[PDB]
Design a protein around this nucleic acid. Structure first.
Ligand SMILES: Nc1ncnc2c1ncn2[C@@H]1O[C@H](COP(=O)(O)OP(=O)(O)O)[C@@H](O)[C@H]1O
Ligand SMILES: Nc1ncnc2c1ncn2[C@@H]1O[C@H](COP(=O)(O)OP(=O)(O)O)[C@@H](O)[C@H]1O
Ligand SMILES: [Mg+2]
Ligand SMILES: [Mg+2]
Ligand SMILES: [Zn+2]
Lengths: 621, 651, 49, 42, 267, 49
DNA sequence: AAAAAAAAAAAAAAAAAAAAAAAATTTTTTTTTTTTTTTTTTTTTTT
DNA sequence: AAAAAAAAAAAAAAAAAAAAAAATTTTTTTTTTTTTTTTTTTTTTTT
């Protein structure tokens, strides 16, 4: 056993006398400055890094990792005790709960009588007067665990897991301390809520009412109470860590306070928290014993590995004029050839600028459909784009169909209500939806995709659901074969319809075979003049481009009009082109300008857009 | 305090006998070695063979079988004492060492139907299929509380009164001190035990036809909770007992029964094979002495009962050995699984080859064209109906992950199902999703399909494209496509008939006396041990009626299984010479001018053709135990693909 | 409680709990039987037991 | 989370013909505190 | 199993202090010599001078004299530990060792007339004249039973709840096995302790002349049973406690107070 | 026992035993007051209280 | 190959069979202690 | 020194207060299981 007063002193010592050179090499009191901030009420969440703690006290780290809840409370109490001596001015009462705390403290001081001893229950609860919250950051030496392996043997421990977020409730107020006011005396009563349910009190235990022996019925109310942002999410194992034949395992994660609104369904996250049980009374327990649920209380949520939330080297790399080609060649380096296809995919990943001229939106998303023979790496390209893009949903033929693409309605648990859960399109709302086997996809699904392309929304008027969803995603379809199957339905919608025909050819086939065989030899593409960018770098560059909206100067108006009219004449003479093609020109040029990271598009961007468009068009022939 | 036994003669005798049995040092230390192995592996459950227990002391065996709880407690005490004697620190680390049972249960081996109330408080080994499972919940076995007001630290213990009389006193969780001081539980210090409840249903192929199935509820605890998932053909050895009802005042006399599992086992076919020193030495000897023709020997010894089809047999061996997956740093994946499609004339033993693969290859799932329809074939998304949450059900492909799916009547299979499995055939994964859930299940299975050509029988005078109604998109992902023709050559008919008649005239030595009918009727199966979860091996099959004679032996089935299991783990690396040879051969193959006239391609040539070339070379390397893909391996791969991809159009 | 009290406080009002271990249980099945179709009068729903 | 149970805390009675028993107890307390015997001279 | 105590700060401190007080080699050695003496004489009670305890540790003296029960429990645990340290073979013979007190008790030295409610749970020293001296009855503390049917032997343990709340389950004497087999109690193996009750009256010369006498009931456990007889003048030191009544849905505030003598000495 | 919420299985009826050592006791005495002999009327009995 | 019809499934709503939960002071008995009365025994006074 | 009267001692019977002892199943809820139904969706057939 351990003396928790000594432990509190240890954590106080650490929190006060820990320093680091984080701030531009200058030595800083990492936690002292944060304590000052949240004593001024400028910060709410205090993330104690257990690596920092272990830097000088490994045993404290082990004790925390073994009984995290106890030491979580110890750290919170130490912070609360230290705040007054770190406060350096009066807070501006930014919150009504701050007003309540001010009034409570002032009245306690007014009726202090310092020498008198008040009963243990005649005092404000700790949680009622915190206005802050202390979380951990798991020590790096703790290997992340598998949701399947997180079992009863590690209840109350601090563990970190990684997985895909499947279901996430909304943020709703969870009572933490229920405040009641009496109708006789005029005191207050505080019930700290710990169980999932509580029975509201009826009789006021205040001293005045106890002396009067009066009724003292008290009224529960939300004004003086203490709520906390609450959320409940389902976190799913990663495909690579599931056993041979099993299905991925889920875990329930309860998120509170400032950890809320971090993760959203579809995100790849790492969550560090304490594995805690919930008592399971109420049911007709078949087997005797105190059985309980299990959940992870979220202390640190970190989006990772697909949607993580500069340097002179990268600035120079951007300044390079061949940065466009560098990124293109970096898109799926293993895939040999398909240079223009990969450039189009990069333009897809970047996207054009959204327009809102006088009450109608011309979305900047780029829609690409890869028609091709078997074995031309369309599936590989779509899978790579899924792994690369931040919000990417890769939907095959019919496994994710109907409500697998559109939202449905499911009963809730926190509220028992009917909540609207998004499908693949909504999960990729503002990213990339890689549709595979688009030709073989169902008719209702195809119509939904057409509607999302034309409007970025999904209207539903079925029985249990009646809503107008929002899915501002870019469609990357991969169909197979007017050649032999070239629907005008696809032509009229897809901004870039690419045909990938692989005619046999000794030289090209031999080069591709050498590429493939080296790939199988060394688990990597053959070395080239330019090393391909790592996915993190590609995502960073693309994201920086995304917020670089370039405009179209009026000088290029006549050039664009001439190119469009020339293409119209060529199409009319030959054996499809329209305003959709013109808008494809505009948004491809805008995306090229954005890639170059300028504010104004140029004739070079327009020419490249036209070149890619003509390559796609003559791929048909 | 309370009553404390001093001289329990039966308990003392049971402990003495169990410790004597577990000593085993003079009895070739079988259980001594098992205890040492579990100590090293950091396990606290000893699995004891009831047959060995009965051989040592039939009295103890009968007492244990007929009195489960008492004898199991005595056995666990003896095991804990033995573990302390061998190593005290480990014994102190683990509070209770459990004992599960295994072996041949004469009468106690039953099914959920035959499991009647006559087996209460006995050890029963019940077979079945897990119809459902429950979430693994922790039950507190020792709670720790801290009182801030007094700084005291108390610890309450709860006994395992699952099938014993329980009172409110034992199951009250302290929430105040004797002076009404609120407590706070130390979750980290507290001791929890994982607990799960599953349902075992009688196997449909074993249940009486046309009747509803019989189920039983099973309780799993620490170290057995996640030993099974829905759809698992499991053998649960446990204690059958009546679950206490809630404190009443009026009782109807009805008692829910349950099986407290002491051991859970899956199908032993998928279990890790036992490789003894002599077995591994024999494998080494085989691989080293014979490497040049080892692949051919294995291919010809694969299915003795099916004559001919040498190339198809070699392709099936390559499929069994598999290739090697490529896990690129950027996440791109390349499957190492060979897909084979046998199409051709009726009565060419294609279904027999598929059945042989089903019987031999581990994790082999049978399937029929219309037997599985979409959601049944791939994974499916349903709802719990009690929680309102989505749930995933594994399909045939998912269950066959890291295995084989043997599909028959592939042509009869609806186009929708083939389109659905397209992804599995190449990416080896199932991508399903509904509104409340989305997953990407792993289905890394090789597809071995059989089909009948359009018009029922193959048309020698029509293109293979027209004979096979499968379009190029589906044909390409099939690594090999073999057309098995029922040629009417008199000499081939002679050979086939001779082989068939010899196989028919064979009788098993010893078991068959010349007139026996081996079929049993629904009783002997339970009477004798199941040959599906059961526990010296030669190398070359002794000469028998299967073949007449020659200077070439046939590989034993068990030896071949062990050799294939060992060789599948090998990941031979592609050499530069083989890489160049394969690249040039792929270029030539794709260039149509290489192949002669009057020759039509069975399936189109593609990057996937190159990939299957590489995979076949890798499989040949695995067969050779080479660890490097060599020129001979590349030659065999190119030979096989060249034979498979072209068929001469007769006229 | 039957126990011959020795002058202590008497056992509680409803002190008895079933000991599932110390019980003799037997199989028991519930069947539904229907009036034979021929035995049913012409216009009459079959009886059940 | 449903295992522990904290007490019920409460604060002081800030704010706010028969006289309440608390009022009479306060008057008794003031009588004990502020009953003066003697004289300015003594 | 039930709610055992993992660590107890106050109990650990008390036992450490008492063991330190009892271990006297750097000091004069009085109490080490006394423990050796009782070991030689084959006894299981040590007389500890409250004056010496107050001299070496004021806090322990105040705690022992104001909350005697648990303090005496800790002192006796320390005594048994010390006796085991000196010689474990003898410490194993006796289940427990007892701590009687002597010396000077400032305000805890009272007469039966002055032994009021204020001294409940405290250690008190009362000098008086014995009036009543009941018989020495054996009280069973550990009963051994034998089942002829199953050949089993059982031991039932009864806690000394003279002044603590007692529930019937504690005092249920077993007569039938689990399956209602007859149980025979083995008297030769069971454990009994001598118990006696006496009454101490205010000394006639010291009592006020006008008024009637005042008396106090004294419980003497083993080793203190036949130390006094009626008419003798004796000093009894022990804990003044309240005796529980019997189970009942109604109760008057009245409680029956007694004195559990920890030592008795002749006038 | 009002504290039955800590566990579904219920405590008996009339379950409470008084714990002696946790009682705050005080001295109490009974006296027999008799009317004043000079207050008792001439032919009467002394009243008591 | 596309449209219409059929059915097949999934999920949600609803109604019993069995099990589980809730609610529960008052009357009478006996033991102890204390007092009153009878007779025997002992003590004290008178002859 | 003995007898007669007085008083005390011992012993037994009766009464009052206070602590102890004895007696004490029915009714309602509600959860689970089963079935029913409405709509969506999927498959099959036909032109
Ligand atoms: N251009 C290419 N470069 C590298 N590998 C390729 C190329 N085309 C096809 N492949 C390989 O062939 C296999 C089939 O490709 P896939 O993505 O299924 O094509 P499709 O999208 O036409 O189905 C994959 O394993 C892939 O690695
Ligand atoms: N080459 C062969 N050697 C031995 N038996 C054969 C051969 N070809 C066909 N058969 C026999 O034909 C029977 C049925 O063949 P089957 O597996 O149904 O082929 P299919 O699936 O084409 O109908 C089997 O029992 C098998 O023994
Ligand atoms: Mg594809
Ligand atoms: Mg067949
Ligand atoms: Zn009030």
């Amino acid at each position: 056993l351990k003396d928790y007063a000594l432990e509190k002193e240890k954590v106080k010592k650490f929190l006060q006398e820990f320093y680091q050179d984080d701030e531009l090499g200058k030595k800083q009191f990492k936690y002292g400055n944060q304590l000052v901030r949240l004593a001024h009420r400028e910060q709410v969440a205090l993330y104690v890094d257990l690596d920092d703690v272990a830097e000088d006290d490994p045993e404290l780290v082990d004790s925390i990792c073994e009984n995290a809840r106890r030491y979580a409370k110890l750290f919170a109490d130490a912070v609360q005790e230290l705040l007054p001596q770190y406060k350096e001015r009066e807070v501006v009462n930014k919150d009504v709960l701050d007003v309540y705390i001010e009034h409570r403290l002032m009245m306690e001081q007014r009726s202090r009588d310092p020498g008198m001893v008040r009963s243990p229950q005649n005092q404000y609860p700790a949680e009622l007067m915190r206005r802050f919250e202390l979380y951990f950051q798991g020590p790096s030496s703790n290997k992340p665990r598998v949701i399947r392996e997180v079992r009863a043997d590690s209840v109350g421990k601090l563990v970190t897991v990684r997985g895909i977020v499947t279901r996430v409730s909304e943020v709703k107020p969870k009572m933490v301390v229920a405040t009641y006011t009496c109708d006789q005396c005029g005191a207050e009563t505080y019930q700290p809520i710990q169980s999932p349910t509580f029975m509201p009190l009826i009789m006021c235990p205040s001293q005045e009412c106890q002396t009067n022996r009066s009724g003292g019925r008290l009224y529960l109310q939300t004004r003086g109470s203490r709520f906390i942002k609450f959320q409940e999410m389902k976190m799913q194992e990663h495909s690579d860590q599931v056993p041979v034949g099993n299905i991925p395992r889920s875990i329930t994660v309860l998120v509170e306070g400032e950890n809320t609104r971090i993760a959203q369904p579809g995100d790849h996250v790492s969550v560090t928290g304490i594995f805690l049980p919930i008592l399971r009374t109420g049911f007709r327990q078949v087997v005797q014993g105190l059985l309980s649920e299990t959940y992870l209380e979220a202390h640190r949520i970190v989006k990772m590995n697909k949607s993580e939330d500069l340097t002179r080297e990268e600035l120079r790399q951007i300044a390079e004029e061949d940065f466009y080609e560098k990124l293109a060649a970096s898109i799926a380096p293993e895939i040999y050839g398909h240079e223009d296809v990969k450039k189009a995919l990069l333009l897809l990943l970047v996207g054009g600028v959204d327009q809102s001229p006088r009450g109608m939106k011309i979305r900047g998303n780029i829609n690409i459909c890869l028609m091709g023979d078997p074995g031309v790496a369309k599936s590989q390209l779509l899978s790579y784009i899924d792994r690369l893009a931040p919000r990417s949903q890769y939907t095959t033929g019919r496994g994710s169909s109907g409500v697998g693409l559109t939202a449905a309605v499911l009963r809730d648990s926190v509220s028992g209500e009917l909540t609207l859960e998004g499908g693949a399109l909504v999960l990729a709302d503002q990213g990339v939806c890689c549709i595979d086997e688009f030709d073989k996809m169902a008719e209702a699904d195809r119509t939904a995709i057409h509607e999302v392309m034309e409007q970025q929304t999904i209207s539903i008027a079925k029985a249990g659901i009646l809503t107008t969803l929002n899915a501002r995603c870019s469609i990357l379809a991969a169909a197979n074969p007017q050649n032999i199957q070239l629907p005008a339905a696809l032509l009229s919608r897809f901004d870039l319809l690419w045909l990938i025909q692989d005619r046999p050819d000794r030289d090209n086939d031999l080069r591709l075979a050498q590429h493939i065989t080296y790939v199988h030899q060394h688990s990597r593409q053959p070395p080239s003049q330019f090393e391909p960018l790592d996915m993190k770098l590609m995502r960073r560059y693309i994201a920086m481009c995304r917020e670089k909206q370039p405009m179209v100067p009026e000088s290029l108006a006549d050039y664009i009009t001439a190119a469009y009219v020339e293409m119209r004449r060529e199409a009319w003479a030959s054996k499809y082109t329209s305003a959709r093609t013109l808008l494809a020109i505009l948004r491809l040029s805008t995306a090229l300008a954005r890639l170059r990271m300028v504010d104004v598009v140029e004739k070079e961007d327009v020419n490249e857009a036209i070149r890619l468009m003509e390559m796609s068009k003559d791929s048909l022939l | 305090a309370g009553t404390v036994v001093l001289d329990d003669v039966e308990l003392r005798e049971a402990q003495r006998d169990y410790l004597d049995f577990l000593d085993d040092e003079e009895d070739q230390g079988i259980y001594q070695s098992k205890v040492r192995e579990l100590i090293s592996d950091n396990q606290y459950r000893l699995i004891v063979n009831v047959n060995d227990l009965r051989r040592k002391n039939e009295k103890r065996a009968n007492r244990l079988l007929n009195n489960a709880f008492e004898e199991l407690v005595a056995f666990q005490r003896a095991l804990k004492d033995f573990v302390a004697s061998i190593d005290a620190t480990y014994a102190k680390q683990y509070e209770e060492f459990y004992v599960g049972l295994e072996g041949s249960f004469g009468s106690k081996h039953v099914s959920p139907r035959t499991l009647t109330s006559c087996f209460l408080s006995c050890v029963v080994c019940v077979e079945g299929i897990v119809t459902k499972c429950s979430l693994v919940r922790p039950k507190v076995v020792r709670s720790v509380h801290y009182c801030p007001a007094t700084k005291k630290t108390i610890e309450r213990r709860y006994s395992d009164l699952t099938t014993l009389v329980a009172f409110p006193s034992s199951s009250v969780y302290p929430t105040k001190d004797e002076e009404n001081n609120p407590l706070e539980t130390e979750y980290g210090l507290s001791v929890y035990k994982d607990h799960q409840t599953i349902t075992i249903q009688e196997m449909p192929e074993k249940a009486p036809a046309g009747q509803l199935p019989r189920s039983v509820d099973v309780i799993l605890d620490d170290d057995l909770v996640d030993k099974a998932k829905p759809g698992d053909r499991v053998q649960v050895v446990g204690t059958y007992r009546c679950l206490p009802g809630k404190k009443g005042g009026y009782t109807s006399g009805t008692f829910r029964t349950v099986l407290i599992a002491c051991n859970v086992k899956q199908m032993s076919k998928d279990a890790q094979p036992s490789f003894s020193a002599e077995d591994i030495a024999k494998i080494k000897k085989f691989s080293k002495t014979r490497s040049k023709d080892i692949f051919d020997q294995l291919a010809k010894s694969l299915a003795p009962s099916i004559h001919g089809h040498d190339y198809v047999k070699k392709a099936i061996l390559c499929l069994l050995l598999g290739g090697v997956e490529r896990d690129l740093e950027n996440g791109s994946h390349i499957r190492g699984d060979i897909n084979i499609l046998l199409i051709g004339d009726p009565s060419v033993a294609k279904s027999q080859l598929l059945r042989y693969v089903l019987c031999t290859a581990p994790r082999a799932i049978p399937t029929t064209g219309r037997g599985s329809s979409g959601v049944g074939l791939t994974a499916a998304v349903t709802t719990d109906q009690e929680t309102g949450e989505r749930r995933l059900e594994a399909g045939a492909m998912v269950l066959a992950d890291r295995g084989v799916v043997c599909i028959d009547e592939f042509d009869k299979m609806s186009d929708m199902d083939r389109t659905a499995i397209h992804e599995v055939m190449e990416q080896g994964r199932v991508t399903i999703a509904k509104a409340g859930i989305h997953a990407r299940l792993n289905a890394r299975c090789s597809v071995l399909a059989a089909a009948n050509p359009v018009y029922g029988r193959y048309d020698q005078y029509k293109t293979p494209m027209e004979n096979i109604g499968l379009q190029d998109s589906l044909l390409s992902r099939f690594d090999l496509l073999f057309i098995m023709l029922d040629q009417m050559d008199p000499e081939q008919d002679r050979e086939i008939s001779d082989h068939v008649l010899r196989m028919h005239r064979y009788r098993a030595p010893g078991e068959q006396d010349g007139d026996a009918m081996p079929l049993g009727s629904a009783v002997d199966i339970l009477a004798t041990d199941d040959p599906n979860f059961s526990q010296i091996y030669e190398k070359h099959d002794n000469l028998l009626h299967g073949t007449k004679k020659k200077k070439e032996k046939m590989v034993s089935a068990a030896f071949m299984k062990k050799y294939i299991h060992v060789a599948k783990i090998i990941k031979p690396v592609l050499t530069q010479e083989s890489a160049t040879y394969i690249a040039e051969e792929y270029s030539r193959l794709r260039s149509q001018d290489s192949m002669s006239s009057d020759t039509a391609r069975t399936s189109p040539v593609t990057a996937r053709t190159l990939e299957t070339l590489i995979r076949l070379a890798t499989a040949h390397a695995k067969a050779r135990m080479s660890k490097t893909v060599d020129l001979q391996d590349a030659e065999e791969a190119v030979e096989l693909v060249q034979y498979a991809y072209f068929k001469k159009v007769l006229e | 409680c039957n126990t011959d009290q020795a002058g202590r406080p008497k056992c509680p009002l409803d002190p008895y709990f079933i000991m599932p271990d110390k019980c003799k249980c037997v199989d028991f099945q519930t069947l539904k039987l229907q009036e034979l179709p021929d035995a049913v009068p012409h216009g009459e729903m079959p009886r059940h037991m | 989370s449903g295992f522990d149970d904290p007490g019920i805390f409460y604060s002081d009675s800030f704010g706010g013909g028969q006289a309440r028993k608390s009022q009479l107890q306060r008057r008794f307390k003031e009588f004990l505190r502020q009953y003066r015997v003697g004289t300015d001279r003594t």
